[PDB]
Design a protein around this ligand. Structure first.
Ligand SMILES: O=C(O)CNC(=O)C(=O)O
Ligand SMILES: [Mg+2]
Ligand code: NI
Ligand SMILES: [Zn+2]
Length: 331
């Protein structure tokens, strides 16, 4: 069995190996990469996402989200308070202000310490989930707006044609902006490219151990667990590495830098934080190996998780018993 300790693997594809996306994902899995839940891919030196980022300040962040925490430093939830619209140039200036900027630090490890000590006492503002792309149309390799669609994968594997579309999303971050513990919708893969700026630290639980994280989360957030049998789908709960280690939960950590891709694998729980002003692009995708995970994915039916149009068909075809209840949650 490859990668039996479920370590995060880092890949350095050549320009030739960067041509065929599906083939390279399958290669990484042949080496056991998926056992970690997360892999890093460093693009060949010949590749670029676009020529420059000099012209992005006029992108609008229609609904910036202030991420307000509740709880204790290592075990907290966050809610998202909507703020007034601002441009990427305005948000970058905000990120760099004395109130929001990254503090002095020695290295990534000191910064991580400071994040977990102090996160709850601040409310950073995240420009998340903005439909769009920063890849140049002429970038042919690993262009997250030109990937094979999940609808087409489901049709190829299962024969059934379904409605829905699959497009990327932009994320503009600042110091302490946080992504809560989650798997993807329908336990899909994700791919995330850090276009520019400061790093993103990730934490991940191996897919084979995801239920251990779920059981801890039920213990640590007992009201939320009574409210919903899949409350991690709400994407609000944070648990620190120290608390995970105290509770024996297997996990790994890695820091992504500008110019690097991360892939999350089906049912790989992940969480993390941004080091300073940055911009990432991410999209979900599927492979043949996903279908069995999609059939087994949990679902929130309490009403909180509220998701895209395209998830309807995935539930309807892969999970027909659950469909009626899940759709009640959507309506
Ligand atoms: O970058 C972020 O805020 C969150 N990203 C992801 O959870 C992902 O790419 O799957
Ligand atoms: Mg612009
Ligand atoms: Ni994710
Ligand atoms: Zn729910």
């Amino acid at each position: 069995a490859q990668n039996p300790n479920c370590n995060i693997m880092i890949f350095h594809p050549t320009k030739e190996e960067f041509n065929d996306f599906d083939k390279y994902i399958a290669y990484m899995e042949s080496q056991g990469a998926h056992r970690a839940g997360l892999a890093k891919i460093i693009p060949p030196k010949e590749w670029k996402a676009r020529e420059t980022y000099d012209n992005i300040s006029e992108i609008l962040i229609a609904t910036p989200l202030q991420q307000v925490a509740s709880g204790r430093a290592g075990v907290f939830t966050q809610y998202h308070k909507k703020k007034k619209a601002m441009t990427v140039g305005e948000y970058r200036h905000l990120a760099n202000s004395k109130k929001y900027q990254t503090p002095p630090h020695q290295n990534f490890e000191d910064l991580e310490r400071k994040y977990w000590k102090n996160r709850i006492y601040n409310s950073p503002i995240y420009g998340a989930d903005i439909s769009g792309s920063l890849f140049d149309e002429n970038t042919k390799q690993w262009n997250l707006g030109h990937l094979g669609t999940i609808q087409d994968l489901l049709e190829k594997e299962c024969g059934v044609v379904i409605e829905g579309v699959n497009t990327p999303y932009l994320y503009f971050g600042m110091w302490k902006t946080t992504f809560a513990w989650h798997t993807e919708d329908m336990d899909l893969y994700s791919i995330n490219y850090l276009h520019l700026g400061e790093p993103k630290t990730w934490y991940v639980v191996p897919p084979e151990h995801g239920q251990r994280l779920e059981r801890l989360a039920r213990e640590l957030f007992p009201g939320s667990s009574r409210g919903c049998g899949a409350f991690l789908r709400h994407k609000v709960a944070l648990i620190s590495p120290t608390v995970l280690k105290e509770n024996g939960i297997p996990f790994n950590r890695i820091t992504q830098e500008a110019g690097e891709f991360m892939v999350t694998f089906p049912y790989g729980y992940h969480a993390g934080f941004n080091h300073g002003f940055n911009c990432a692009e991410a999209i979900n995708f599927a492979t043949p190996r996903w279908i069995d995970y999609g059939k087994m994915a949990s679902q929130c039916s309490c009403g909180e998780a509220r998701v895209t149009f395209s998830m309807d068909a995935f539930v309807r075809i892969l999970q027909p018993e659950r469909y009626d209840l899940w759709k009640r949650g959507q309506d």
